[PDB]
Design a protein around this ligand. Structure first.
Ligand code: FAD
Lengths: 131, 9, 661
């Protein structure tokens, strides 16, 4: 039952009493430890200040305008060819392939993978992507 | 002893 | 209740028989519960009667009259109870108009060394029992460590000053018997730092709360963690306080470290994120140029050239999504990092001013125990706490000397008579004293018993001021060596006008350093006349005794001038400075529980000495040498009530021996 806010452990008491100068020793070990952490803060916050300087402007110049094309159910020969190339570059990732074409849902792409597998040798295309 | 302490609380 | 309150005022439990009672009434306490309640009521009632009017002797007859059945049924029981109470000084103690005058025929002869309160209390009881009593006193006055300064209307106690509550205090009885002007002390005590500026209220409360927390901590350190020995030596209260303070200073540092240690962790997360964001900005920059070059190729174009524009477009929006998610994560880490810089933990445990104000609270504790905290036993310094009286602390306006002088009336007191040697044998004792004025005028007093009320300081004196023949046994001398005898001095400042606040009874002064924390740390105003009383406590007491009264009065005026201003503080009319450690009839102020001592040593001091037989193979002699005084009473040490009670105790022990129980 120690007093609230007073800190007194068997371990801490023994460590202060162990020697005649162990008390003064323990307090400087922490004082030195504190200086070594404060200098490491000043180092990393100056390193972090340099990285912030390099990001000045963000990615606003390299930002591309948003395009929202109305998803269509019919596949043009153009769209079919974009897909086969997207399959070759991105493999089995269906979301990337949908983004490339621009007007085909992930389900339609998933359907396409089965429908045209025979005619567009999709199995061969996947093997080439894996290599 | 303790009893003689001033401002006892 | 009235009967229950009488037991409380007599420091007895109202509903239970004590150890003392068990010894004198073994038949009753070993017997049925009903007889015990009858006994307890008779005792409680007899006490009530005495307490309701302690100015006149309460006889056995008077007691029996005012009792009622079935309690007044048994007359021998009522007589045994009244007799016990009278013998042990619980009734008919102090100054009472005697009903039946004392018999001219006296039984037994007792010499009492010292005319202090312990001596005077015992002497009255013994004379009251019809023994021949003579007190030997080295001083030209009675009262001993109760000393009152007097010049005109100026009146100030250099010794005992305070009645530490009337609730259970036998001085309550003495105050109804003697005209003492008991005036309550007002607890309000403002501090004033080295400069003369009152400690700000908010801060004063903070340091006081920390002092009490620090004490509470030393108790925890003692009783719970069993931190009571260190390198064979017993642990001082001062050592424990040092250890507790150091652990509080450690925690403050430990706390800072953990706070700065979680800032670097946040900065090292930010560093690892910013690096990821810089590398991603480069990949975005490169991939934008690639998209531009692909889009530069104007339509119409084959599907591979179209795919290159589309694939790079989707690849660039993907990387621009990541960077925006990383820019989100960056923003919340920068907020967390600003919150840690906003709420730093405590800088220091206590400032230089805080440590000075805390040193005043330690000075107060060094005053109370009349010794440096480095001497006090951690475990046992407060061993008498359970027996402390209830009610407001009081002062004597008349001066405390009014009490012993009252007790001294009708007693054979030889003043200017310094005991040099105490001889005790199977046949009796002889005490060898001298005249203090002409030290060659030698006196021999023959007695059946000697009562020693010599202060612990005098008993400690090496080489001895008083020789015991034969020498006191090792168990007595070891107790004397072990036990602490402290020091505490008073500076009396008499003025023509009050420049202080009359509503405030006492005000502190904070010392510059730790070393000087006791030096004039507190001022008392408790009298009608314009008198201020400055206390010299702790390590300061011993050192300030080797300094002239002028210099001491100087340092007092300086400190007072700083608080009330140079114009308001005149030169004092009369100045007095106590030097109790140098006083050869005291050799200090009062007992303290020294490191390596305990309450058990106070009991050893009270134990009487039995001499060996004169002729070998002769029966075990009776005890001849008895001891009283504040150092002999374990439950009320270092007090006037303690002295008083120790006297009453020894009177009963001596009467029981030489007149029979
Ligand atoms: C500064 C100070 C403040 C105090 N304040 C308080 C207080 O506020 N409240 C409180 O309750 N108590 C207080 N006390 C304690 C109180 O004064 C004592 O506890 C009490 O007076 C002790 O009485 P005593 O009979 O045991 O010893 P003493 O009063 O010392 O009596 C012993 C007697 O022996 C005499 N003597 C010594 N050597 C010889 C010798 N060789 N031959 C013959 N006679 C000798 C002495 O002169 C003295 O008269 C204070 C003490 C001091 C010093």
């Amino acid at each position: 039952k120690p007093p609230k806010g007073m800190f007194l452990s068997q371990e801490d008491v023994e460590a202060v009493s162990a020697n005649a100068t162990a008390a003064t020793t323990v307090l400087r070990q922490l004082d030195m430890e504190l200086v070594s952490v404060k200098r490491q803060i000043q180092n990393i916050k100056q390193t972090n200040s340099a990285l912030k300087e390099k990001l000045d402007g963000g990615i606003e110049p390299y930002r591309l305008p948003e395009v929202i094309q109305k998803c269509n159910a019919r596949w043009t020969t153009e769209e079919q060819l974009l897909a086969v190339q997207a399959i070759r570059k991105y493999g089995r990732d269906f979301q990337a392939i949908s983004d490339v074409i621009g007007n085909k849902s992930v389900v339609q792409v998933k359907n396409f993978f089965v429908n045209y597998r025979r005619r567009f040798n999709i199995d061969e295309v996947l093997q080439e992507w894996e290599a | 002893p303790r009893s003689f302490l001033v401002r006892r609380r | 209740s009235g009967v229950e309150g009488a037991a409380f005022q007599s420091r007895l439990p109202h509903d239970r028989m004590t150890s003392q009672e068990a010894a004198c009434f073994p038949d009753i306490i070993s017997g049925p519960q009903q007889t015990q309640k009858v006994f307890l009521f008779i005792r409680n009632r007899t006490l009530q009667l005495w307490l309701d009017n302690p100015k006149i002797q309460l006889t056995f007859e008077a007691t029996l009259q005012q009792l009622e059945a079935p309690y007044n049924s048994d007359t021998v029981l009522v007589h045994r109870v009244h007799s016990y109470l009278e013998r042990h000084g619980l009734i008919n103690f102090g100054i009472y108009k005697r009903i039946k005058p004392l018999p001219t025929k006296k039984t037994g002869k007792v010499i009492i060394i010292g005319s202090g309160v312990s001596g005077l209390a015992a002497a009255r009881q013994l004379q009251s029992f019809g023994m021949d009593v003579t007190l030997l006193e080295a001083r030209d006055r009675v009262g001993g460590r109760v000393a009152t300064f007097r010049k005109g209307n100026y009146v100030a106690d250099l010794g005992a000053m305070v009645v530490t509550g009337l609730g259970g205090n036998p001085m309550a009885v003495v105050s109804k018997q003697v005209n003492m002007e008991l005036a309550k002390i007002k607890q309000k005590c403002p501090l004033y730092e080295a400069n003369g500026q009152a400690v700000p209220k908010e801060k004063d409360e903070m340091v006081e709360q920390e002092f009490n927390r620090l004490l509470e901590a030393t108790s925890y350190l003692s009783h719970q963690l069993d931190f009571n020995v260190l390198n064979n030596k017993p642990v001082s209260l001062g050592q424990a306080l040092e250890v507790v303070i150091q652990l509080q200073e450690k925690h403050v540092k430990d706390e800072q470290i953990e706070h700065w240690k979680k800032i670097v962790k946040t900065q090292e997360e930010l560093k690892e994120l910013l690096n990821k964001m810089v590398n991603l900005k480069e990949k975005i920059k490169e991939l934008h140029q690639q998209y531009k070059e692909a889009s530069e190729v104007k339509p119409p174009r084959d599907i591979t050239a179209e795919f290159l524009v589309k694939s790079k477009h989707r690849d660039l929006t993907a990387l621009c999504k990541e960077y925006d998610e990383l820019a989100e994560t960056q923003g919340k880490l920068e907020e967390k990092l600003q919150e840690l810089e906003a709420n730093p933990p405590s800088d220091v445990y206590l400032s230089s001013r805080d440590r000075q104000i805390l040193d005043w609270h330690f000075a107060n504790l060094e005053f109370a125990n009349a010794t440096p905290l480095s001497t006090l036993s951690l475990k046992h310094w407060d061993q008498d706490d359970d027996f402390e009286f209830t009610g407001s602390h009081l002062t004597v306006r008349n001066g405390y000397s009014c009490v012993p002088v009252a007790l001294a009336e009708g007693l054979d007191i030889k003043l200017n008579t310094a005991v040099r040697q105490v001889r005790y044998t199977a046949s009796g004792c002889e005490v060898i004293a001298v005249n203090t004025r002409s030290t060659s005028q030698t006196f021999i007093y023959k007695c059946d018993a000697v009562l020693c009320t010599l202060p612990l300081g005098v008993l400690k004196q090496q080489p001895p001021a008083v020789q015991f023949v034969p020498p006191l046994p090792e168990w007595k001398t070891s107790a004397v060596q072990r036990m602490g005898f402290g020091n505490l001095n008073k500076v009396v400042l008499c003025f023509d006008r009050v420049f202080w606040d009359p509503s405030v009874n006492l005000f502190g002064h904070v010392g510059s350093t730790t070393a000087s924390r006791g030096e004039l740390f507190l001022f008392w105003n408790l009298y009608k006349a314009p008198i201020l009383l400055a206390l010299v406590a702790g390590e300061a007491a011993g050192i300030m005794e080797n300094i002239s009264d002028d210099v001491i009065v100087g340092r007092c005026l300086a400190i007072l001038k700083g608080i009330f201003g140079s114009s308001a503080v005149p030169q004092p009319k009369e100045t007095v400075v106590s030097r109790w450690r140098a006083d050869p009839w005291a050799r200090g102020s009062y007992s303290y529980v020294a490191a390596g001592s305990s309450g058990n040593d106070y009991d050893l001091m009270a134990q009487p000495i039995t001499p060996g037989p004169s002729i070998p193979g002769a029966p075990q002699p009776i005890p001849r040498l008895f001891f009283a005084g504040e150092h002999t009473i374990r439950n009320y040490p270092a007090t006037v009530h303690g002295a008083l009670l120790s006297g009453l105790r020894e009177a009963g022990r001596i009467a029981d021996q030489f007149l029979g129980a």
